[PDB]
Each structure stands twice: as structure tokens, then as C-alpha cells.
Write a protein that binds this DNA or RNA. Sequence first.
DNA 1: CTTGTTTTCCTGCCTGGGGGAAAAGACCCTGGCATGGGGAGGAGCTGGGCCCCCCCCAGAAGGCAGCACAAGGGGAGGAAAAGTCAGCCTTGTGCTCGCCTACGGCCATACCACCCTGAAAGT
DNA 2: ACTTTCAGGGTGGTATGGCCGTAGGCGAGCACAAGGCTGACTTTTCCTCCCCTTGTGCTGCCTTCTGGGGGGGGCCCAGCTCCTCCCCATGCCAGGGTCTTTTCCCCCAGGCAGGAAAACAAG
Lengths: 82, 82, 92, 95, 106, 107, 99, 99
Amino acid sequence: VLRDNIQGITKPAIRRLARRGGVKRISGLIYEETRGVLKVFLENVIRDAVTYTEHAKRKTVTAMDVVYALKRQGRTLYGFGG
Amino acid sequence: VLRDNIQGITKPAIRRLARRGGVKRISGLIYEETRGVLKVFLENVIRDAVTYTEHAKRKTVTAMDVVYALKRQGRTLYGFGG
Amino acid sequence: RKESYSVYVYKVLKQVHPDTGISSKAMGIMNSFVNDIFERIAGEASRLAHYNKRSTITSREIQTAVRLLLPGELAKHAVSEGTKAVTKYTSS
Amino acid sequence: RSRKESYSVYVYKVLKQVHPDTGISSKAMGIMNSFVNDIFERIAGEASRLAHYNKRSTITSREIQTAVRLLLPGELAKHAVSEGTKAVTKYTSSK
Amino acid sequence: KAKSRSSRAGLQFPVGRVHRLLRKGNYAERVGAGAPVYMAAVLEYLTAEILELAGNAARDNKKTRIIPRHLQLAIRNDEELNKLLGKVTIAQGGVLPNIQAVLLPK
Amino acid sequence: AKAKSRSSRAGLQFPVGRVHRLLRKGNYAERVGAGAPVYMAAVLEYLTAEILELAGNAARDNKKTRIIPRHLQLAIRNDEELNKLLGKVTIAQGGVLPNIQAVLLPK
Amino acid sequence: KPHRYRPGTVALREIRRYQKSTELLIRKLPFQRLVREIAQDFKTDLRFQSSAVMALQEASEAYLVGLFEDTNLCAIHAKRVTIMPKDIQLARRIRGERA
Amino acid sequence: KPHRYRPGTVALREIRRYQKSTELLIRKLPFQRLVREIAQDFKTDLRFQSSAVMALQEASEAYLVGLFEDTNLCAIHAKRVTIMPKDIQLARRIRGERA
DNA sequence: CTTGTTTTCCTGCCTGGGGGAAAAGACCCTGGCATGGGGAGGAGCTGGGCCCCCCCCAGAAGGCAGCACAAGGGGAGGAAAAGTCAGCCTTGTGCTCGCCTACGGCCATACCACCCTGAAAGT
DNA sequence: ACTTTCAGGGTGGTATGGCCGTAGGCGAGCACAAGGCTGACTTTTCCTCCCCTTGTGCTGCCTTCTGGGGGGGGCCCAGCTCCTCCCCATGCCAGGGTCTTTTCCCCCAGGCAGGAAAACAAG
């Protein structure tokens, strides 16, 4: 998992997400744009979750850590506890 | 203070607000849309302010009531106490 | 051990939909909903007491927290529900 | 008339430290007081939520530091954490 | 003659556990006697309101069980519930089927 | 013993004792540690000094010797970190940043 | 014929002037009347602090100016320089006020 | 010659198919590797609960779908059906993620 | 590419008003003392997160055809911008009234705290 | 179905908050200019909108191959629990050092007149 895993978000996957979003046609640079946007979002959430994990003096990120990190960013998530 | 005071937000005032927003050209339908948007925003803030005032068993709405109403909507205001 | 509202969400489901069941995934979601609304109402009532320099959360602070947090017709029915409960609870 | 309280005195001392020859107006001082109260409330609420998440009863400098890390952006949080740690070290290890 | 307080208030939500949650939640120094009753009435009302619409959605799909999809359908179809839970993600809930009218063939 | 100020002991200007009292009476936890007020009063002093320095720079740029709300707003909206911290905050009588999109400028 | 400025340069001068200032761009009396008229529907025989009305006005000006900035960005997106109601609507829908 | 579909009908049927489902649209293993690669710059030797990675994936997918709806609105604003990186940029800026 | 024309910046002069210092006090912070309790630490246990193995088929990737959509150009019209002129209504000032709010004082009941037990809800 | 943890009953104490009284600050209300801002009309220009056309970039489809998903097994570390106890935080009281409110006056900001300079747009 060390290097260049952003390409694992394949163009078919991004098209599936866009289709769920109601998008009909997709330009070719959208895939790179989406990879960057998702990377920024994930960096924010995982930084907040790791902060909680480190404060709890744990070595394992729990689903509750992610739920708290999402709550403090304004995106509440139901279905993983809380 | 009883009827039709939304028209007191005049077209020159809306133009000045747009100019502070950096707008160069304004359509003639923008004024009656800005008035409705402002009306909705003021209704939302004043409802919460009056709810705070009634909870405090007061009859005069205070700057602190308004500040709490604005804070509750993610619109924290500096300068009028708090 | 751990606690939740599963016993009471189920007893509420059997009152509005006596035949319909609930998945453990849907029940776990309903538990996050109840905990999220409780912390919303209690947090607003906590601030309401602090603004007024009170040290007690009474039914008045819960009633005002409900009217601040819930939308129009949800608040009218939630307040009518809470008021009806306290009226019957205090009167025997 | 009941006496109110504010951060104006300490804001003024910090201002005379950072800019010895420039003043401040009453409205700017009110904004400074609102800012200090806002940040205090933010950090204290975050530390309270942290201590509740970890089933703790005491809000500690550890909770304050983790609230600061969760609330401030990169360089601001770095420098605020450093300032808080140095202040607590001076308080505990001297005088 | 040791009646429960939930039975005294006529509710199916736990007044005693709501009272304990309010007392140990660091919300104020004191908690009044009617506050847990009011809070447990509001929570019960909201839970019933959501479950009714979720069961309606489940019956709409000829399913006898409420699932996260049905909860999502109920929340997003109800205008007041959508406004209340406007910043909430329901896991495995999906989205409402919605296509912009410009994307449909002429 | 001659009462020694905890702010002086910590090295700060902000009121460590008043911060402790506000933490204790704010209903945040059952207990408040001894280092929590000292840490919070240091963070609040650092964040005050940052804004005050930037606003003093903004006042000097305008050839004023007294900070007014305009200077605080200019400091906040020109600092990347402070703008992010106070992104949902309205400064009364602070104005907006000078900014015109290139599309609207004359050709 | 007299001297006349081209359409759009006085607008730029006004943009510069109003972005250099901090004063309130809506007259205080009509805004106060609007605030009282709106509060009537929530509670009759209400009173207001001058500071309360001032806080409401400052909040409203900040809100409207930010909304106009987003509206201008939507107008430029649609390859226009004139802002239209649909630009305000798109801005509000994206920021989450229209859904 | 064989029969083929016109460009757009398959797009609409894919929209209809993926708007009726709830399953995650990203492959779980490459999403997990991405999450573990991002977390490596915050703390080395991090373990992850399977439910934690699942929660991250559900949050990320809901965020991307909600963003693509706003991107589609911005694309339609410019009299288009194809979404471009500038539509995403405008949507994120108006949302507040780019300011 | 010049010259006239509005508009804004700069500088000196006058002025006023609001902020920074001074003083009395009042109020809460600190020191000192006693004390229960929470959380840090040393074990012990086991649940699950990691890691490897094998298989397979479902999905991704690359290529090709073809088409439909984005974009640029051109032209018409209609709708803002700018300028001018008459009016009106905001605002700054001044005077009045009385209502509401905030404080004080007294006390009453409502909630905390604690000791026990039975039952509710968690596994 | 067992159980074991917690909600309910009864009692003591006091502290928070409710009620009556009171005073003044400030919010509402009324005149009264007057002049600066608004409303309206006119010109016309320039920006929006529509139509056409090109080519390029996107989609749809087909085939190959990879790698994600799904079991299967081992393991060892990390999270959780339990028991000690001790150091820290809490509660309380006495006394002064700090911070709040009032007073004032002098310098920094506001207003204005006059001149210089800087873009603008016509030719």
C-alpha cells in the first residue's frame, strides 16, 4: 500500500459514482480531478480519525474514530455505531 | 413597520451590495430575487432570536439573542457581544 | 455489557407497524438516530440554561431546545407529545 | 450596576507587546473579546467531547492539546501546541 | 406499588435511563423531574415518525422488513425529516432516483 | 505567602485563574486538571498575538496608529490559516477584501 | 455632445469604491421596518435593541455580499458578465439553502 | 450489420441502474490500500478495523456522489451535458471546500 | 498616437471625540488544609487484524468505429449603464413618557445524595 | 431463559429559583428641517442569445487478461478487564492583589479647501 494507490479508483468506478450522481456524459480529465478531490477528502477525514486514535493511546483506527472524525467535519454517518 | 417594507431594500442598495460582491453587470430581475432571499434569511434568524427572547421571558429582543440565533445557523458574528 | 434503545425502538415499531420487522442494520441505524437527536436536544438545552444563568435543565429548556432544532411541523407535534407526557406524569 | 468581565486588559497587554506604538478602538476590542470567547468555547467543547469519548471525568492539558490539533489548521496548530506545551512546562517546572 | 416512571408518563421510551444520561452528560448542574419525561416523549415521537415512513417504504417494495434503504427513502422523501437529517449519511442507503430533465431524450 | 499569579508563573498575560474558573463553571467535565487552564490560556494568547500582529501590519499599511475592525478583517482574510479558522465568522464593519475577477476588467 | 463614460467603467469604479469601504449599504430605517414587520409574525408587541437591529443588518449585508460573490462566479461560469436569478439559484442550491 | 445503442441511452440506463442500488461502487481492496497509504503519512504501523475502512468507504462514496450532483448542476448551468473539471471546481468553491 | 475632462489622491489647517491613563473599591484568585476518588500501572486474556495460499470469473483496459456535442464565428435585438432632473424621506436633533428589566430580599419546594431492593433488559 | 446491573422508594438537607417590590435605563413616540439619495426617463451601446458548422473527444462494443473477492488457516499483538493506591482535583475559608467602573484631557482621526496627477474616451 506504499505507493500510487490512487489509480485503484478506476475510471469505471468514477463513472459508476457519476452515474449514481445523475451525470450523463463525462470529460476525460474528470477522472484525475476526482482522484485529487477524493484524496483531499480522505486526507482530512483520516487525519482527524488518527488524531482521535492517538489521543485514545491506541494503535488501531476504530469505526467510532471515523464516525467522530466525520461528525466534527459536518458529515454525520449512521450505521457504524454512535 | 406593519406592511410592505421589503420594497425599502431599494434597487440602489442591492446594486451597492452587488458591487461590494464584485458584480459588474446586473439583470433587472436580480432585485426582486435578492429581496426574497433576504426575506427568507431574516425570517430564519428572527425566528430563533424571538425563541430565545421568549425563553428568557423577555419582551425586547437583544443583540445577544440575535448573536445566539446567528451562531446556531453557522453564521457567528463578532462585534455585538459574545 | 452495552445498552441501546433496541428494546424501545422495537416496541415502537410494533405500535405503528405491528407486522413489519426490522433488520439489525436498520435497527443499528435507528440507534444512531436516537443518540444523535438526544445529543442535539440536550446540547441546545444546556446552552439555553447557560445563557439564562440557570443551573437546571427543566422541561422548559427541553421545550425550547426542541423548537430551535426541529423543523416546523415536527416541532409542533414533538412539543405536544412532551407536554402531554409531563402533564400525565405529574398528575399521578 | 453589576460588573461585567472581558479579556480587554490582556488583549491590550498582548497588543502592547506585539505592536508597542499602535492602539486599538473599542469596536476592535469588542471583536477581539468575541474572538477569544469563540475560540475558548470551541476548544473547551472539543476537550469535553474528547473526555466523554474516552470515558474520562477530567479535562486535561492532553485533551486541550488534542482539541487544538483537531481545531486549528496546520501551522497555527503547530505553533499553538508548542506555545501551550512550553507554558505548561514553565508552570509545572518553576516558581 | 412500585410503578415505573415510563409507565407513569405513558411512554415506551426509558425515562429513567434518559434521566441518567442527562445527569451524567455534563449538560448542567441539575436535571428537573419533567425533563427526562419531555425528552423521552420527543425521542419516542421522532422514532415512531421515522419508523412509520420506513415501513411505508418497505411495503411499497413488497418487503416485510425495514432496511437502511427504506430508512433512506423515508428520510429523503419526507421534507421535514430531510431538513432535519440534511447532513446525515445513512450507510448502505443509496440515493433517491433523480434524473435532470435536460438529460432525458427529446 | 505572597499570592503569586498563575499567569505570571506560566509566563502568560492571559488570566489562567479566570480560564480555570470558566472551565470549571462551563459544564465541560466533572473535573478540570491543573494544566488545562495553563494550556488554554497559552493557546488563546498565541492566537490573539497572531491576529493583533497582522492587524497592526494592516493598520501601518493604511498609515493608521489605531486598529479598527477593518484591520482585523484584512488580517484574517489575507492570512491563509486565520481565514480557514474564522471562515464562518462575520466581522462587524469589517468590509470585504479588494478583489475583481479578471473577466470583468477592460480589454 | 458632453463627455460620457463607457458602459462598465463607472461600474468598475463603484466596485472599487464599495470594496474599499465598510459602511452599511442599506438605509437603516427601511431595514428596521422590515425587521419589525418580520418579527410581528413570531410575536406581537415585540421590542428591539438598537444593537439587535444593527447586528441583524450587519449579518444581512455580509450574507448578501457573499451570495453575490457566488452568483458572480456562476455568471462567469455560464460565460456571462450579467448576473441573473438562475445564478443566485444555482449558488444557493450548491451551498445548501434550496436543496 | 449488428444492432448497437445510440450514445446516451446506455448512459441513462446506467444512471437508472446505479440510482436504484446501494452497493459500494469502488472496489474494496484498492480503496483499502488507498486508505492505508494516506494514513501512512499520519502514523506508521496503523491497524484498521474492517468496519472503520467500511465507514470511510461509505463516507467517501456518499461525498463523491453528492459532489457529482452539484457538478452536474454546474454543467447544466453552462448549457452542457458533459461535466468538466471546471464544473467540479465551481461546485467545490461554492460549497466552501476551495473558497 | 495628442488634448480636454472628469475623478481621485495628496497635503495643509482646524476640530472634535474617543481612547489611554489615573483612582477607589469590590470581588474573585491564591494560599493553606483536609479528603475522597479517578486514573495510571502491572499483570492476564483473547478477539481480531494481519498475513499468506489458491482459484476463478467478473471487471478493467485497450483498441476501433462512429457520432453527437462542445466551441467558435457571425449577426440581431433588447436590456442594462450612464447621465440628468424633480421629489421625498432618511437622518440627525431635540423632548417626553413610561415600561421593562435587572437587582434585592425572603423563603419554599425540588433536586441531590444515600441506603436498599426488586425488576428490566442484555446476553 | 438467567442474571446482574440499575431504576425506583423513602428520607434528610439545602440551595436554586420563584414572587413581590423598586428604580432607572432605554426603547417607543412625536415634531422638524434639508439635502442627499431615490425614482423616472432617455440614449445607445454592448452583451446575450440564437443559428450554423466543424472536428474532436466521448461513448458503445468486443476481446484479453489481471486482480479483487472469497473461503481457509495461523498467529501474535493490541484492546479490554481487574485490582492497588496514590497523587491529583474538590471543597472551604480568609485576605489581599487584580480587574472593573468613573473621570478627564490630548492626540489621532475626520472634514474641508485647494492643487496636482491619473486614467478615459473622443478624433
